[PDB]
Structure formats: C-alpha cells, structure tokens
C-alpha cells in the first residue's frame, strides 16, 4: 500500500529516482537537494476492485442520536443488554443487509453475522 512521503525541507512530496552505479532507489525533492534512501521496491499501487468489508463509519457519540433504533441483545464483552443498531453506512448498491451493533456502555462494535 503505497504511502506519500514528503520532503523534510519544503513539505513537497518526494519523487522516485534510480542510482545506476549502485543500482538503488532514492526519493528526491525536485525543489531542493534533499535525497533519502528508499526502504522498499514498492512505490506505487493501483488496485481495481475493492474487497473491503463494510464499515459502520463514524462511531463517536453515536448513542446520542435519537432517531437510531434499539435492541435487547447481550454484549459479548461487558454483558450489557442495551445497545444501538444500524445498517452499514457505506452506500454501495450491492451491500447486504447485515446489521451492526454498538454497545451503550463499552462502545464495542459487533455484527449480527457470526460467521466462523
């Protein structure tokens, strides 16, 4: 997973370059003389289809939203029976109807799909 690297001088992103006589990769800033040594042959990455598990999104202070439903399911960690539950907040067309539960006390996230 390629990460942007900024020059330590002027915060500009570092462009790759090659060293033929030593055959090694370096990152240089086109504006200054800073040169740093590359730690991996992985500089860029271009994935096509996202195999990302669906995420509940923002969770902070979600228990104060009064338009969000409730349930009496039991917490797997703190053994509490009060929690908030909602569907996946990522708006893809093909998302399944798998729930997400956020516990009221310990703020623990879990799902209704207990696949082993």
């Amino acid at each position: 997973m390629t990460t942007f690297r900024f020059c330590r001088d002027c915060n500009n992103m570092l462009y790759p370059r090659e060293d033929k006589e030593n055959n090694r990769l370096l990152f240089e800033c086109r504006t200054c003389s800073y040169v740093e040594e590359a730690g991996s042959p992985l500089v860029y990455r271009h994935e096509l289809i996202t195999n990302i598990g669906e995420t509940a999104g923002v969770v902070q202070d979600i228990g104060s939203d009064p338009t969000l439903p409730r349930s009496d399911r039991e917490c797997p960690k703190c053994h509490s029976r009060e929690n908030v539950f909602f569907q996946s907040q990522q708006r893809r067309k093909d998302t399944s109807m798998v729930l997400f539960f956020v516990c009221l006390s310990c703020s623990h996230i879990f799902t209704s799909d207990q696949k082993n």
Partner: protein, 732 residues
C-alpha cells in the same frame, strides 16, 4: 393537575393558535417587514452620488475643479390619501377607491442634502477639495422631497382598517368577515401569490450519465462556481478543474491554491483531506499535485487569466493586478468581499472539493433536488424590494444625468425639478396591475402571473386564493419529479388539493399551520457563538484536532469546535427561553460532525409539542399540563394568556422541513405511554408530538366529512369543485 393531555386540549391549543395568528398572517407580516425595515436600507445602500468635473483649462478662471455630492436620509410614509383635479386633498378610503376606480396608495418622503466642493486644479498635484456650500433643509418642512407613491395592502400597519372595531367597520361599511391581504389597484382587488425558489449558498453535488467525459459536478450559487471532476472511475487520470467567472479556458485546483497564497504542496492535502489514515483520498489527489508542481508561480496563471479578457495586448503587470482583483472581488462573494480573507476562501474551496470527492468515493449519494427544505418562498415583501431597488437605481441614474446636463450649461439645478417622481409611481402601478414583474420596456421576458385578481365567488374561494404558491417551472415542462408529492410535504402542504390539467402539482396550497419566516440578523448569533468557545477558522490545524465539528452559519464556514453537545443544549435552551426568536433553525448532523444554522427568509415551519423525560413519573411526557389548558380556556372565555405565552415558556416549538431530519414525534399523545388498527410504535426516545393530524390538510379539504373513507382522487375533485358553489361571499 400534572395529568397527561387529551385531544380536546389539542383543539384548545389550535383554537388559541388561530385566535392569535389568523389565516392570512403571512402576507401582512411580510408587508410589515418590508415597509418598516427593508425600504430604508434600499435607499441607504446608494445614499451618496458624486460628480467630479475637472477643469477644462480654457482660461485661468476655468482652472477650478468641482465636486457635487448628493445624500439621502430618512423615509416617512403618510396614510393613504388622494388629491382631486381641483387640488383639494382628502384621505382616501377603500370604498371611494372601489367605486371611483382609484388606487389605494400613499406617498413617500425622503430627506435630501447637497454639498459643493471646489479645488484648484494644479497640474502634477493631487486635487484638494474643501467644503464651501452645504444645502440641508432638515430644520424646515421643505427638506422632505416627495419621491413617489407606494400602494398599500389592506389591513396592514399603515391602513386605516388596522384598528377598526366592529361598529367602525359597519359605519365605514366593511364586512367583519374580511381579512385584508390584498391591494386595490385601479379600483380592482389584486393579490400576490407566493413564488417558489431554490435556495442559495448551499453546495450541491450532482452526477452525470457517461457518454461524456464528465463524471461529477459540484455547484454553488452565491456568481457561480463549478469545480468539476473529470476522469472515469478506476482510471489512472484524475482531473479537478474550477471554472471562475470571466475566465473561459479554466485552470486546475492546485494552480488555484498556489495563486491563492498556499505555496507548499504538503499544506494542500491538509486543506483538502481531514483524515490522515485514508489513502484513497490522497490517491485521487495525486495527479493534481503532479500537474500543479511544475509551476510554482502565480504569475503564469495570472497571465492565463489576463489573455481571456475582452481587452487584448494589455501589459503583463496590469493583467497580474486584474487577475489578482478577480479573486477577492468575484470569487465566492457570499463569504466576504473586502481584502485579506484568504484563509477562509482556501478552506471553503477545500471543503467543497472534499465533499465532491467523498461523493465520488461512493460514501454518499447525490443531493436530492426535490427536498422541500432546500426551497424558499418569496412573498410580497422580497418582490417589492427587488422592483423598488431597480426603479430607485434608474431614478438616481436619471437625476445624475440631468444634473450633468445642467452643469454642462453652467445652470443651477432645482432639486424639485431634477426628480421625475412619476417613474416610481408608474412602474409600481404597471407592475401590480399587469402582473408582468419587470420594467415596462423589458416586460416580455419577465415573470408573469405574479399578481392576480382576487376571486370572490365564495368565501372559501377567497380563503384558498390568499394561500397559494406557484412553482415557476414551465407548466408544459415534462419534469415529473416536481409534480409528484414528496415525503417532505408532510404537514406543510395539503396533499389533497391541487389543480388539474397543466398545473397539476405545480400549484401548491399550504396547510392550516404552515407559516413562513420573516428574516433576522445573523451577527448576534455569530458573536455569541464565538463567545461560548468557538475557535476561528484562521487558527485551525487539521492534525492537532482531527475530530472537530465544523460550524456553519447560513452556508459560510466560520470555524470548528470540539465539544458540540453542550453547545446544542445551550443553544436550544436559549431558543426556548426567548433569547433568540424561534424562526431560526439549528440542526446538528452527528454522522458528519456538522452544525448548521439558518436565519434567512423564506422557510416554511409548523408548530409541534415538546417531550421531556420526567423522572418523577419515570418516563417521558409533554411539558404541557392541565393547568395551562385551564388558563387557555379562561382566557378564551374572557374574550390574559395567549399563544405567545405558550411559546415563550418552552411548551411548543416551530420546526421547519430541515430540522425534522433529526427529531422523533409521537403522533397521538397516548402513543407516548408504555374500529381501526393502530400499532404501538417501538420508539421510546420521543422528542415532540403532533398537535393534531387533521392539520396536515388545507382549507379546501377541511370541509369534506370523513375524508379518510374516500379514495384520494375523490378528495382532490371535491377540493376543486368547492370553489364553484353559490353562497354568501360577503355579508355586505
């Protein structure tokens, strides 16, 4: 006395509501707002008029340069009256206007002051003018320059009918069952129907089908700014470009940031993306950085700007200055206009492109264009302000032209001769009579049907006519979505009553309790908001606090905040305790960590109840009690304790169609406790209650008996045919 509430109490509260407001209050309140406040500001906008006549250098005595200054002052409005052909003056009353084919109107008086400055035109030196003559007749009644005549809407503050009792109305021969709310023009009654409009200062993200290279669009109207993203999804090439006003070719976004004042490349992404961990955001921004890195110069972009102007061959430095001025003058004027506010503009552009790219990453959807919370209604007030501004501009231009003409002949101008007072009067009368909302010369392309002749066939027809809104889309336009009923119309629009034919759905009628906001100043709100712990947008660093709520006021970002829950609780405490008028809307979006505050004009709101958690009863209950209902009955029978008494005690609340997105309402009061089929709703965190469901209907459909046992088109048909029955339209 601490008991719950029954539907009888609901009808009691509604009775109080109509005993306090009335069915035509919206027109009267808009007219009062226009006459009291906006009229003064329209003239105070352009008070000073300047003529600078340089020396012709014909002779030594002609070496003096002159300056002429014209300033305006107060506005005075008289009660309506008429001067006959004999020159006699008598107060005009509606009966005489009706019978004699007159026009119910009054006269406007404005103070005028004049100053003359003279300087010695010495070549190579700055002209130093000195005060010599100042004509100001504020100490005499001759200082009030007559400027024109303004029509008056019936029963408004100025009209004689405002304070008339029943015997007064009878001796003057009024119908006591008349409500006002209409003009008398040329001896015929005219009315202005509300005009619907799409709101401004709101960023909207759209989408496109893809036979074209376009993929997404982000719009804002303040002057329009379009920041478009080009490049199909999944491809390597990502382009983000903005289209500035008076620039044709367009230039990328990184160039905008460089020209704007943020040179380092690392700060660009701190401006755009507010979450460090996300890598897709930066992946989509990479080509912008790559392309914009080539030029670290503002001046190449400014040269780009300079070439595309109409003038050609301008020197480079002048083009630099011109392109520099374009940004602070015409780029996002709704934030600021004066110099030196660059951080705010940079952050707002970053926020706009952030939202566009968020929609581009399928985390959200297109903005709904039908949502009734993003639409404003223009009443008589705003339309009159528009036309008055235009006519006043033309009149002052004519005064300046004539005064220059008489200066050319070295003749003193009489201020009572330079003014053509007939311009304002003729323009206003023509617009109100014909309805074409524009200048007489350019009336063909102007809006039509804004002013209509009141319908007196039956009393309910007058009631239905004074409560009508028109959506100015082509009535032959084949857009189905504006026609259909939408989920946001619950309680603010009558679902049954709509015309048939080409105006189906396009003409709307309000329900019994959907009022409209007048308008209020946002400055005290911003001052208090900064007082109670708001960090300004200048000192905002994303990495120091990446979990900060953003704060908006009428669509302009003013900064961030860290603990919003207590701010919302305090704000609603102040709104419920009368520190702020309840026409202001205050929404919080938890999911996106946002606060929005609206204080503009044109928002439809309806009353609702308040649910609070009573610990003594161990559960929630309304703030209203049997004591308040008993007081309401006592006051009603005594016809004190009124609707505003309920409002200021935090017992009811006005909710628009936007705050409704973040509330819960129990429809029957008994639904709040732990034939037909009524289901017990699972909710237990209720916040408000419905005063009564019957009020979701208009005035036309409030006469059908048992309307819910009927097919809905039948209710529509009777709502149409209820305006052709024969009956006593007025008791006089």
């Amino acid at each position: 006395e601490s008991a719950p509430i029954t539907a009888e109490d609901s009808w009691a509260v509604i009775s109080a509501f109509f005993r306090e407001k009335g069915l035509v209050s919206q027109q009267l309140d808009s007219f009062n707002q226009f006459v009291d406040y906006t009229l003064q500001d329209i003239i105070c906008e352009d008070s000073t008029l300047i003529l600078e006549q340089l020396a012709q250098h014909t002779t030594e005595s002609d070496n003096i340069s002159r300056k002429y200054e014209i300033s305006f002052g107060k506005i005075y409005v008289t009660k309506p009256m008429v001067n006959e052909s004999d020159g006699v003056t008598h107060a005009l009353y509606p009966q005489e206007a009706r019978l004699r084919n007159l026009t119910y109107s009054s006269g406007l008086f404005v103070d005028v002051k004049k100053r003359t400055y003279e300087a010695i035109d010495v070549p190579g030196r700055e002209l130093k003018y000195e005060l010599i003559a100042e004509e100001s007749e504020d100490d005499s009644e001759s200082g009030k320059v007559f400027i024109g005549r303004l029509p008056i809407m019936l029963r408004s503050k100025n009209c004689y009918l405002s304070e008339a009792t029943e015997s007064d109305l009878y001796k003057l021969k009024e119908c006591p069952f008349d409500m006002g709310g209409y003009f008398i023009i040329n001896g015929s009654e005219k009315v202005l129907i509300a005009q619907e409009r799409s709101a401004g200062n709101i960023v909207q993200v759209f989408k496109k089908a893809a036979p074209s290279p376009i993929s997404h669009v982000a719009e804002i109207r303040s002057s329009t700014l379009q920041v478009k993203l080009y490049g199909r999804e999944g491809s390597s090439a990502r382009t983000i470009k903005a289209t500035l006003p008076y620039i044709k070719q367009d230039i990328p976004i990184v160039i905008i940031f460089r020209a704007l004042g943020i040179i380092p490349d690392g700060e660009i992404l701190e401006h755009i993306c507010y979450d460090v961990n996300d890598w897709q955001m930066l992946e989509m921004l990479k080509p912008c950085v790559e392309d914009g890195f080539v030029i670290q110069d503002r001046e190449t972009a400014l040269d780009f700007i300079g070439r595309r102007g109409t003038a050609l061959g301008i020197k480079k430095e002048k083009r630099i200055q011109y392109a520099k001025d374009i940004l602070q003058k015409e780029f996002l004027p709704h934030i600021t206009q004066l110099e030196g506010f660059e951080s705010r503009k940079a952050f707002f552009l970053g926020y706009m492109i952030n939202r566009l790219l968020l929609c581009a990453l399928d985390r959200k959807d297109q903005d709904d264009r039908d949502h009734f919370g993003k639409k404003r209604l223009d009443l008589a007030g705003p339309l009159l302000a528009q036309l008055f501004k235009t006519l006043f501009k033309k009149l002052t231009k004519d005064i300046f032209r004539y005064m220059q003409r008489t200066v050319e002949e070295a003749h003193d101008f009489n201020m009572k001769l330079a003014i053509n007072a007939k311009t304002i009067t003729s323009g206003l009368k023509y617009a109100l009579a014909t309805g074409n909302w524009g200048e007489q010369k350019k009336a063909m392309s102007s809006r039509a049907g804004v002013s209509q002749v009141l319908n007196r066939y039956t009393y309910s027809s007058t009631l239905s006519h004074l409560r009508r809104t028109n959506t100015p889309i082509g009535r032959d336009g084949k857009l189905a979505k504006p026609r259909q009923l939408h989920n946001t119309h619950w309680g603010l629009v009558c679902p049954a009553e709509t015309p048939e034919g080409q105006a189906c759905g396009l003409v709307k009628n309000l329900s019994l309790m959907s009022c409209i906001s007048v308008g209020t100043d946002p400055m005290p709100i911003i001052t208090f908001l900064s007082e109670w712990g708001m960090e300004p947008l200048e000192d905002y660093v994303p990495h120091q606090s990446p979990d900060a709520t953003r704060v908006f006021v009428n669509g302009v970002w003013h900064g961030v905040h860290r603990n919003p829950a207590r701010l919302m609780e305090t704000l609603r405490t102040l709104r419920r305790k009368g520190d702020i008028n309840p026409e202001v809307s205050m929404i919080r979006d938890i999911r996106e960590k946002e606060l929005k505050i609206f204080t503009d004009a044109g928002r439809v709101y309806r009353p609702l109840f308040i649910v609070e958690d009573d610990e003594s009863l161990g559960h929630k209950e309304l703030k209203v009690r049997k004591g308040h209902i008993a007081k309401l009955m006592a006051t009603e029978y005594q016809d004190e304790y009124t609707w505003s008494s309920l409002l200021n005690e935090g017992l009811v609340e006005y909710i628009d169609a936007e705050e409704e997105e973040s509330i819960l309402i129990a429809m029957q009061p008994e639904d709040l406790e732990p034939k037909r089929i009524r289901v017990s709703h699972h909710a237990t965190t209720f916040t408000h209650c419905e005063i009564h469901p019957s009020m979701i209907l208009g005035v036309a459909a409030s006469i059908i008996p048992f309307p819910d046992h009927n097919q809905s088109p039948r209710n529509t048909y009777q709502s149409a045919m209820g305006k052709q029955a024969m009956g006593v339209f007025l008791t006089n």
